[PDB]
Amino acid sequence: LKTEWPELVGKSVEEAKKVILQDKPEAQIIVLPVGTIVTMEYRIDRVRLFVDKLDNIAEVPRVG
Amino acid sequence: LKTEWPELVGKSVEEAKKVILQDKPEAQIIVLPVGTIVTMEYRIDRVRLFVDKLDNIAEVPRVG
Amino acid sequence: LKTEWPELVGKSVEEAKKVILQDKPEAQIIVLPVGTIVTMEYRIDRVRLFVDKLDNIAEVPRVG
Amino acid sequence: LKTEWPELVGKSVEEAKKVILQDKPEAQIIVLPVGTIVTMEYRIDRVRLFVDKLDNIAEVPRVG
Amino acid sequence: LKTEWPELVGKSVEEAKKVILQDKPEAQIIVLPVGTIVTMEYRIDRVRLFVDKLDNIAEVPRVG
Amino acid sequence: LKTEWPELVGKSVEEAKKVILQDKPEAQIIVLPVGTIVTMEYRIDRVRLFVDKLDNIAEVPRVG
Amino acid sequence: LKTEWPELVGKSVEEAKKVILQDKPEAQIIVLPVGTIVTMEYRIDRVRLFVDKLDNIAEVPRVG
Amino acid sequence: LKTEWPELVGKSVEEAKKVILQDKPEAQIIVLPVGTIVTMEYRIDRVRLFVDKLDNIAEVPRVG
Amino acid sequence: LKTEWPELVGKSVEEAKKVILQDKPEAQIIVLPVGTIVTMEYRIDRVRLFVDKLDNIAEVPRVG
Amino acid sequence: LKTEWPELVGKSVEEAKKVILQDKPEAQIIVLPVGTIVTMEYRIDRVRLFVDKLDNIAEVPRVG
Amino acid sequence: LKTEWPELVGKSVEEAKKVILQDKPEAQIIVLPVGTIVTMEYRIDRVRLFVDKLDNIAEVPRVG
Amino acid sequence: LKTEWPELVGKSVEEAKKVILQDKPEAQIIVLPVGTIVTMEYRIDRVRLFVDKLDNIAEVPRVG
């Protein structure tokens, strides 16, 4: 399953959209300047617990 | 499919681990203080394109 | 009760406003670039206490 | 409806928990150092749209 | 005493200025994009002490 | 009216509390490490309007 | 000695320059958007020591 | 007039205090870890104007 | 060529070091808390040019 | 092997691209404003382990 | 040896370039908006060691 | 002239100090956790001009 497009680095948005929609017809393509947000790899086995000063769960745990 | 544990907000790490491993035996549980990183919802239909000043792809596009 | 519009990811502002105002006629719609602020889920059961070096309440506690 | 506790500024965590649980027996109390995260007022009428370079919706819109 | 204008969320700058100057004729109105600075509630009873590694006062204490 | 204590820079928390409570018996004293939050002068004549991409009011305007 | 111009809040750059140069003919006036940098009060009696993990001086101490 | 102590880089806090108080008996010495705040050179001729979206003065101008 | 160890997520530092040194005997292993720095994928084909206001090269370009 | 172009500091993007593509015909050139992201030297011998509160591996270790 | 140009504060880029190139004919002049990056004084005697959780060297030490 | 110690990555502070002081007897060694500050290469030919909204010099230009 193809989930990354390293061949598109350096290419135009127009070329990137054409290639991505060929491989992933349902793609919802979002165009952002570098450094807008810090993306993160999704790990379906991982569950992060964010805890407070007393080691209680402070945010809703979710897979990723 | 259960991917979030809102019932665990306010509970201890020990209780959270017990509940999560019951629902998701393979979970790799990570314990972090609030505010360490900014997590983000994973959207399997979305592909973000991060672009440079000339609208060329600057980072490897990936699903999420 | 509908409080999220995942179907609007990738659509235009114009389409998003039309859909949101159909579902939520009172919506006050605000349009911001990605990464402007870090939004956070509202949890009506939760009360965060922000404390100082001596574990005294430093900000007004509020629900959320 | 009471949703804020300005009278607790300057008091201990122990006193704050006692008062909050009297007013809101279901409260899930989280204790964090000042400056950990930037909280934000929840506005049930507001819907923020976070948009990309081409004014398309980049994140799931939600009430708040 | 009116110190907040929740009714103005979603309205134009022009409408906001008209309403604010009606309620507060002396208002010095400043127009900034979201996320420029992090504003903070002013609490006339509170005095924050900002301390150094040795718990000495490092900045001039002021009310707020 | 005294609202600042420049004479306390360099002194201990204990000395600072004694002086502040003499001048302001109602003070709610909060002790934080330098750099925890960015405080800001309160200006009772000023009203900041935080606006979105379309120059609409995005946050509740308040005095300060 | 006048070192601050609170009367200029809300006025134009043009008006501000005229007033400041009347009071301080040598002023080197710099025009920046809000939030560009975090300015800090200069205290001629204060000397900050910035220290490393072993409590050694890590940066050149200077008055301010 | 001596306003900087480059000879103290690498020395202990104890040695630094002894030297600084010899040169500047009135010094109010503050000890902070590196990176706590971003200090800035004070320029007595300079006046920064921080402006809003409409080029109006948004903060009190001050010398420095 | 193995350059990533996804199987180590959730395991101890001790187990991780043992596995990494088996696969990569020369590894120089560094142990940091999450969120200390933002790491980035190295792309041997890519050359980033960081430019100033006038589109001149402002930093030494390097592969990566 | 040439992996850095210190001779290009101060030159135009156009000149930089010409020189880089002469030395590295496969270069994928990305043009970004200064300060967009914090780049980091790639060290093929190094493996960073990012750990959680309990010293467990929190992110996939990778060479660099 | 002249390494700083305090006389140029408040002057135009054009005037600054003329003066700097007179004093330093080899200068590679870079023009950036305030707040883009945090510059730092170079100290030829200093060597910073950046260490990990176990006090091992985590980055290549360099003079400065 | 040796100005960097890549051979010390992964070694202890004690070993690093011994090696650095052998090569550079005058070194003023500072020990900081990773991510405390963002260091930057010093370029003796470069002069950065930091400019304000009107392209006037806003900070003292210096070599580096």
Numbering used by the authors:
A (entry chain A), B (entry chain A), C (entry chain A), D (entry chain A), E (entry chain A), F (entry chain A), ...: 3 to 66
Describing publication, verbatim:
As scaffold for implementing fold-switched allosteric assemblies, we chose chymotrypsin inhibitor 2 (CI2) from barley seeds. The small (<70 residues) globular single-domain CI2 is a paradigm of two-state folding in which a sturdy native structure unfolds at an extremely slow rate via an all-or-none transition. The CI2 native structure contains a four-stranded β-sheet and one α-helix connecting strands 1 and 2. The C-terminal β-strand is inserted in antiparallel fashion into the sheet’s middle, breaking an otherwise parallel arrangement to form a unique fold that is specific to this family of serine protease inhibitors.
To identify possible spatial arrangements for assembly, we analyzed the crystal lattice of CI2 by X-ray crystallography. CI2 crystallizes in the hexagonal space group P622 in all the conditions we attempted that rendered crystals. On the lattice, the protein forms double hexameric rings in which the two rings are packed head to head and rotated by ~30°. This spatial arrangement is strongly predefined by symmetry, and thus we identify the toroidal D6 particles of the crystal as the target for engineering a CI2 assembly. An unexpected discovery was that we observed domain swapping at certain crystallization conditions. Indeed, crystals obtained using salt as primary precipitant follow the standard arrangement of early structural work on CI241 (left), whereas crystals grown with PEG feature domain-swapped dimers arranged in the same lattice structure and group symmetry (right). In domain-swapped crystals, equivalent monomers on the two rings exchange their C-terminal segments (residues 39–66) to form dimers that covalently link the rings via the active loops (right). Domain swapping does not affect the monomer–monomer interface of each ring, and thus is unable to self-sufficiently promote assembly in solution, but it does demonstrate an inherent tendency of the C terminus of CI2 to unwind, and the robustness of the toroidal D6 packing symmetry for this protein.
